[PDB]
Swiss-Prot record:
Expressing tissues: Widely expressed. High expression is found in heart, skeletal muscle, ovary and testis. Overexpression is frequently observed in hepatocellular carcinoma samples.
Compartments, record wording: Nucleus; Cytoplasm
Assembly mode: Interacts with HDGF. Interacts with trimethylated 'Lys-36' of histone H3 (H3K36me3). Interacts with trimethylated 'Lys-79' of histone H3 (H3K79me3), but has higher affinity for H3K36me3. Interacts with IWS1. Interacts with H2AX, POGZ, RBBP8 and CBX1. Interacts with histones H3K9me3, H3K27me3 and H3K36me2. Interacts with DPF3a (isoform 2 of DPF3/BAF45C). Interacts with SMARCA4/BRG1/BAF190A, SMARCC1/BAF155 and SMARCD1/BAF60A in a DPF3a-dependent manner.
Protein name from the UniProt record: Hepatoma-derived growth factor-related protein 2
PWWP domain segment(s): 7-64
UniProt similarity note: Belongs to the HDGF family.
Task of the protein: Acts as an epigenetic regulator of myogenesis in cooperation with DPF3a (isoform 2 of DPF3/BAF45C). Associates with the BAF complex via its interaction with DPF3a and HDGFL2-DPF3a activate myogenic genes by increasing chromatin accessibility through recruitment of SMARCA4/BRG1/BAF190A (ATPase subunit of the BAF complex) to myogenic gene promoters. Promotes the repair of DNA double-strand breaks (DSBs) through the homologous recombination pathway by facilitating the recruitment of the DNA endonuclease RBBP8 to the DSBs.
Range within the parent protein: 1 to 93 of 671
Amino acid sequence: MPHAFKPGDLVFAKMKGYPHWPARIDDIADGAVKPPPNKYPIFFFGTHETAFLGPKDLFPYDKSKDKYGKPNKRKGFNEGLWEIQNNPHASYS
């Protein structure tokens, strides 16, 4: 049975106008801008962008990889696929 999301959880994260994108729940570093209530800081692999998402847009990686874990035409996407598969917990700063 699922827990709530925690820092380090890998997901595909859905934003409007983007395909489900390889992403992880980032930790909030000392001194970093905190998310709004009920939002997680999402670090998107490949683009290395952050956005704040709620769980409705967060699809746990292992369950969803069969569906979303396929190359995409979009910038940084396949790079993102490599990172989530090969080194999801590294520093990309």
